[PDB]
Amino acid sequence: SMVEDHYEMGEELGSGQFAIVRKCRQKGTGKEYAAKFIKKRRLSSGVSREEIEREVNILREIRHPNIITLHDIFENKTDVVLILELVSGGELFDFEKESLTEDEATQFLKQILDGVHYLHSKRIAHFDLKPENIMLLDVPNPRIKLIDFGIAHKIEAGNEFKNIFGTPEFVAPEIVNYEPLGLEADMWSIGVITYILLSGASPFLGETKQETLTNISAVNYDFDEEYFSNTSELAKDFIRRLLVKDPKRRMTIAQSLEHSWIKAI
Amino acid sequence: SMVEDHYEMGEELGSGQFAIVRKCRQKGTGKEYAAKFIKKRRRGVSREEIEREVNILREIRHPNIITLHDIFENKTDVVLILELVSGGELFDFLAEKESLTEDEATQFLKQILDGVHYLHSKRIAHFDLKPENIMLLDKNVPNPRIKLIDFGIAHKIEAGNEFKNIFGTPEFVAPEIVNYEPLGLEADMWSIGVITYILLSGASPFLGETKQETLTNISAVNYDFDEEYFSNTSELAKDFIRRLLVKDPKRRMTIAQSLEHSWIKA
Amino acid sequence: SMVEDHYEMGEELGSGQFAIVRKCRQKGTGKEYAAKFIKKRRLSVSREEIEREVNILREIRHPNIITLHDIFENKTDVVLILELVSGGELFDEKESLTEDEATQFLKQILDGVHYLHSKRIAHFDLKPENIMLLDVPNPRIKLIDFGIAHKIEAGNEFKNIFGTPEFVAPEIVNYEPLGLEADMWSIGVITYILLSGASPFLGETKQETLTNISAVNYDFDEEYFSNTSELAKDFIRRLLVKDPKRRMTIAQSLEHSWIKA
Amino acid sequence: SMVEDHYEMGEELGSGQFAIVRKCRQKGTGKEYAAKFIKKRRGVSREEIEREVNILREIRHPNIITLHDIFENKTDVVLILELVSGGELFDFLAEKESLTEDEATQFLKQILDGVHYLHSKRIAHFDLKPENIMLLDKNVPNPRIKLIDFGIAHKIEAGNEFKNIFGTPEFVAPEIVNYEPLGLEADMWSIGVITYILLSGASPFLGETKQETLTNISAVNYDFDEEYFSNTSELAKDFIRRLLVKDPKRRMTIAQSLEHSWIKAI
Ligand SMILES: C[C@@H](Sc1nc2c(cnn2-c2cccc(Cl)c2)c(=O)[nH]1)C(N)=O
Ligand SMILES: C[C@@H](Sc1nc2c(cnn2-c2cccc(Cl)c2)c(=O)[nH]1)C(N)=O
Ligand SMILES: C[C@@H](Sc1nc2c(cnn2-c2cccc(Cl)c2)c(=O)[nH]1)C(N)=O
Ligand SMILES: C[C@@H](Sc1nc2c(cnn2-c2cccc(Cl)c2)c(=O)[nH]1)C(N)=O
């Protein structure tokens, strides 16, 4: 392609399994972007054509202020390059505060919930919600962007979807147990994110991957007074309603926006 | 890469001899572009002519000139993904305006001049400047932006290389095209003179009753400023045109001189 | 100098008598600036006049006044890298303005001039062309062009013939002692134009204009001012006053009821 | 132009053999700079001044000092340079409570980015040592490193052998000590020495006399004494070991160093 005729590539910002993300600069304007290079499967030796289309069709369909914007798209013989909106404020948890107040946390959280509400209203599950994928653009309460739709999927009801994916610490028990997946998995992950926001501790993280997965599958967590002594009963109830094994009993996205902790500004 | 994986095709915008141009939509973003399909000679356009057009588009980056966004090539065709101009032809927009002052006219003309100045500073002649190839990007804004299109016969002019050709639309070509004499950057300036004449009057300066008359009028530089068309036209605007409609290309006003002329400076 | 090592020069924006101003772009960052080239007198503008302008720019730091960013000199020219104003001139078009929208711009001009006058600096060239915007219902104004600005010491007479005729006080026209009061007259002229879109003293020739200024011949023609409060007219009336000692000063003007409301 | 028309001189910051560097203030703006006065030949040769200046002109990077202006009269060259107000890196580190390998590698990565830019232009600094690694402002959350003093920097041309004896003994590669051909690899050795000092606070080759130091450098006689290095990862030691290598052709290059796991670990 002509991607290098339009964008000057710069410093590497991230590597995933078959993706590399670099800072780049639009040559005409000086505006900065993120360029995500995704290796294509050519088995005359990558990611299949079908998985790239899934990511791209999902990005095409979503237009929301708390969700990353896809600006441009190129393909050469080895790679598909997505020109994405650049987030210059870095990752959430990096803004660094040990833990947060309930006001500061709820302001971030409400933005994530609005984002996920938009996604879920389109039947799109992100499946990879975690602190690393919550980016800020800058202020007392800055503006959040959800990124990385690399494993996002449209959920069709009556059509079973199973997979093993995500980062262990943040995945729902239905991922761990290889059980049917849906929009409810994102809500579990929101529960985990909320726990970390208020405490600076991960709720299920054990001494090994094996312990972590056990704790997630049995829903073994607590509100240790070392981490949660500055925590309201309301905030704990909000988390308690999300860290629920049965996905049919777990609080949904609309319910979560109407919960008293979020409603109390 | 297959063009149909990336772009959805739409309404046809234009057809040339082995090129067709359609509006298209980038599948990842929803953004609109123009797709120019060019049939390759394997009976087609020569590989050499396609490369010339493409290398010229690659090299040019200017707000008054169409932007080449991407390229696709299979065995039979070259597809150029170009910037979409949604505003239509300049002169068509001007025919929707109640009146047109010399100030408002010179503001459009200055955009064309900036574009050509950029080209000429890279030794690129367009060779096909005429109303059809002066577009607006969006005609609904307070001050629309002009875009030059169609680099189908554009050429880099190399010193110590004579370049001769017969091309362009007769009405708009310099006498050196008509007479099969050496060509350069000066041909574009003649064409700017013709465009300027039409802008202010709505009449074509050399157009005769037949192609044969038109070519005679161009070769002899037979035109006038009939009071029926030019009675509201300043002496300055006429001088600007008179300095461009000059037979000897070495005496014709150049692009830098034209930007410094009092009519444009005002 | 190394000015061209730091800044890429672009389109010409303005020419004055021995100044040219171009758009430029800082090479490291992509940030845009205005570059003002000022031709140096070599008998093979005087050094003293360039220093005056520069020392004035150095001393002034105010949000409604242009910021000097950098400064270079080569053999023919002194180049000032100035803050770029991308909103254009004030008067661009609305034909005339409402009193609310006018007073919002005007208050910014007054704050700027208040800062200047508190440092004993007269601008001497206040006019619409030198009021620039940066963008909104009421955007931010910047005063530019300190090319004839001067420090006024009281008991030191300063006389000159300068400025644009239409906007100069009668003490300029009559070659009488000048001070901070000349800016206030010019503020009166600007205010008149803001509300009406007409110039108060402009005649059919320069000769008429200068006569009208010197005699203070102006009116509030109903064609231009039927959309005008008594308060706004009083504000202007207190500025278009021949005797500079009777003319409303900058502090008084900020306290006048039209501005306070 | 006379320097005293534009800049007011202040506090002296450093003296070399025919250079003095002072803080100064730009008269038009109030902005602070460093002024480097260089006496011209009983002086520095015209050739050496041009070398330094051309190198500074060519380099634009956030971790490298910026040359702002130049003045020249018959006796002197004055370089107006960016002012670094934060002091020497190592001096800031001696104010810090502790220093983790994470916080250390964040400083080191800035030096590496700077040297990567230099080496990509075929410029060797040849004088990398703690005194020349400055912070621009030590009061911000993450201070920015600036490399200074291009007084012996050189463009390296292939097919041209370059030999010299220069630098501060403690920090020079064995090819300087042995009067062998020099290149970009000499900077990498010096980065190894700086890294050793960063993590331990000890100099790896420093002996009881200059004579011992030079012996130690030439034989590559150093260790990772457990008294200084017991809290140091195997990775950090490997990174240093790959730089303190006698044969310049075997020594880790700047690109390799940015890709090494210790640095890549963020
Ligand atoms: C492998 C990539 S996937 C990915 N990264 C993004 C996106 C947007 N910004 N960034 C990103 C990654 C690392 C650093 C920064 Cl600043 C930004 C996106 O849509 N997908 C990752 N998560 O690091
Ligand atoms: C033979 C083609 S060549 C061509 N057409 C262009 C270009 C850009 N826009 N358009 C175009 C043509 C017709 C209508 C419109 Cl809206 C746009 C270009 O670079 N070459 C033509 N002019 O019809
Ligand atoms: C000869 C210049 S003097 C001048 N011009 C300025 C300044 C700041 N911006 N501009 C300027 C001039 C023309 C256009 C634009 Cl956008 C800006 C300044 O301090 N003195 C003039 N009045 O046009
Ligand atoms: C003789 C000078 S050579 C030099 N010194 C610089 C430069 C930039 N900053 N400083 C400097 C020197 C000492 C203290 C401080 Cl704050 C700054 C440069 O390019 N050459 C020296 N190393 O002391």
PDB file of C-alpha atoms and ligand atoms in Angstrom, chain D residues 11-23 34-37 52 56 65-66 79 81-88 127 129 131-132 134-135 146-151, ligand 4:
ATOM      1  CA  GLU D  11      26.485  32.972  35.543  1.00  0.00           C
ATOM      2  CA  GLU D  12      29.424  30.968  34.255  1.00  0.00           C
ATOM      3  CA  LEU D  13      28.532  27.248  33.871  1.00  0.00           C
ATOM      4  CA  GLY D  14      31.747  25.653  32.545  1.00  0.00           C
ATOM      5  CA  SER D  15      35.232  26.171  31.135  1.00  0.00           C
ATOM      6  CA  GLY D  16      37.197  24.071  28.652  1.00  0.00           C
ATOM      7  CA  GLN D  17      40.571  24.910  27.125  1.00  0.00           C
ATOM      8  CA  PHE D  18      39.346  27.649  24.705  1.00  0.00           C
ATOM      9  CA  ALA D  19      35.593  27.530  25.452  1.00  0.00           C
ATOM     10  CA  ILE D  20      33.596  29.208  28.219  1.00  0.00           C
ATOM     11  CA  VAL D  21      29.858  28.573  28.690  1.00  0.00           C
ATOM     12  CA  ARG D  22      27.567  31.041  30.442  1.00  0.00           C
ATOM     13  CA  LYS D  23      23.893  31.359  31.155  1.00  0.00           C
ATOM     14  CA  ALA D  34      23.487  28.891  27.389  1.00  0.00           C
ATOM     15  CA  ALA D  35      26.152  30.851  25.465  1.00  0.00           C
ATOM     16  CA  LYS D  36      29.294  28.934  24.453  1.00  0.00           C
ATOM     17  CA  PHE D  37      32.167  31.275  23.599  1.00  0.00           C
ATOM     18  CA  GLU D  52      30.959  21.009  15.910  1.00  0.00           C
ATOM     19  CA  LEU D  56      24.703  20.634  16.029  1.00  0.00           C
ATOM     20  CA  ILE D  65      20.930  19.781  23.142  1.00  0.00           C
ATOM     21  CA  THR D  66      19.537  22.271  20.625  1.00  0.00           C
ATOM     22  CA  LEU D  79      26.932  29.409  20.124  1.00  0.00           C
ATOM     23  CA  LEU D  81      22.430  26.773  23.040  1.00  0.00           C
ATOM     24  CA  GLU D  82      19.428  25.448  24.887  1.00  0.00           C
ATOM     25  CA  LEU D  83      19.814  25.901  28.635  1.00  0.00           C
ATOM     26  CA  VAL D  84      19.693  22.748  30.786  1.00  0.00           C
ATOM     27  CA  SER D  85      18.684  23.786  34.294  1.00  0.00           C
ATOM     28  CA  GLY D  86      18.440  20.380  35.959  1.00  0.00           C
ATOM     29  CA  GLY D  87      22.120  19.632  36.530  1.00  0.00           C
ATOM     30  CA  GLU D  88      24.011  16.398  35.943  1.00  0.00           C
ATOM     31  CA  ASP D 127      32.595  11.992  24.966  1.00  0.00           C
ATOM     32  CA  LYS D 129      30.267  10.269  30.368  1.00  0.00           C
ATOM     33  CA  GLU D 131      29.239  15.108  33.213  1.00  0.00           C
ATOM     34  CA  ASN D 132      27.732  15.323  29.706  1.00  0.00           C
ATOM     35  CA  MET D 134      22.160  16.540  31.892  1.00  0.00           C
ATOM     36  CA  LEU D 135      18.570  16.979  32.970  1.00  0.00           C
ATOM     37  CA  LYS D 146      19.873  15.991  27.338  1.00  0.00           C
ATOM     38  CA  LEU D 147      23.197  15.026  25.842  1.00  0.00           C
ATOM     39  CA  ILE D 148      25.632  17.913  25.657  1.00  0.00           C
ATOM     40  CA  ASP D 149      29.098  18.822  24.440  1.00  0.00           C
ATOM     41  CA  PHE D 150      29.724  17.846  20.822  1.00  0.00           C
ATOM     42  CA  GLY D 151      33.239  19.250  21.069  1.00  0.00           C
TER      43      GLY D 151
HETATM   44  C1  LIG E   4      33.097  23.667  28.245  1.00  0.00           C
HETATM   45  C2  LIG E   4      31.652  23.141  28.229  1.00  0.00           C
HETATM   46  S1  LIG E   4      31.183  22.490  26.580  1.00  0.00           S
HETATM   47  C3  LIG E   4      29.447  22.538  26.623  1.00  0.00           C
HETATM   48  N1  LIG E   4      28.801  22.790  27.737  1.00  0.00           N
HETATM   49  C4  LIG E   4      27.340  22.813  27.692  1.00  0.00           C
HETATM   50  C5  LIG E   4      26.671  22.586  26.535  1.00  0.00           C
HETATM   51  C6  LIG E   4      25.338  22.677  26.817  1.00  0.00           C
HETATM   52  N2  LIG E   4      25.283  22.965  28.141  1.00  0.00           N
HETATM   53  N3  LIG E   4      26.422  23.073  28.637  1.00  0.00           N
HETATM   54  C7  LIG E   4      26.619  23.287  30.067  1.00  0.00           C
HETATM   55  C8  LIG E   4      27.881  23.157  30.664  1.00  0.00           C
HETATM   56  C9  LIG E   4      28.011  23.275  32.042  1.00  0.00           C
HETATM   57  C10 LIG E   4      26.893  23.473  32.840  1.00  0.00           C
HETATM   58  C11 LIG E   4      25.648  23.568  32.249  1.00  0.00           C
HETATM   59 CL1  LIG E   4      24.245  23.850  33.182  1.00  0.00          CL
HETATM   60  C12 LIG E   4      25.504  23.452  30.882  1.00  0.00           C
HETATM   61  C13 LIG E   4      27.392  22.292  25.308  1.00  0.00           C
HETATM   62  O1  LIG E   4      26.857  22.044  24.230  1.00  0.00           O
HETATM   63  N4  LIG E   4      28.770  22.299  25.429  1.00  0.00           N
HETATM   64  C14 LIG E   4      31.526  22.140  29.355  1.00  0.00           C
HETATM   65  N5  LIG E   4      31.327  20.776  29.146  1.00  0.00           N
HETATM   66  O2  LIG E   4      31.596  22.568  30.485  1.00  0.00           O
END
